[PDB]
Amino acid sequence: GSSGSSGVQRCVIIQKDQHGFGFTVSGDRIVLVQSVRPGGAAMKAGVKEGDRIIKVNGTMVTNSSHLEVVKLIKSGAYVALTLLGSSSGPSSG
């Protein structure tokens, strides 16, 4: 396929703690974490704003549309999300 230095992506799983997750995304083609609960299953998982989703429960959503991604997240207690590249700075952020 395309030729581009394959960055580094990790797999993070979130288990519903408060009757649901604590993160939300938005985007047609590219999906990125819009917001993150101040203490939701997502925050405790390590999900920060600006994380592109690669794989979702064995379902590649690199192109899929938000909607498709949403429903997917509503499948199973938890959801294995593969984020690529994390934030890094001198400030707690």
CATH code for position 77: 2.30.42.10
Total number of domains in the chain: 1
Query: What 3-state DSSP class applies to 92?
Result: coil
> 14 with 81: CB under 8 angstroms?
yes
State the residue range of the domain holding 88: 1-93
Two tokens, residue 5: 């230095």
Q: Which one-letter amino acid corresponds to residue 87?
A: S
Method by which this entry was solved: NMR
DSSP-derived secondary structure for 11-78 = EEEEE-SSSS--EEEE-SSS-EEEEE-SSSTTTTTT--SS-EEEEETTEE-SSS-HHHHHHHHTSSSE
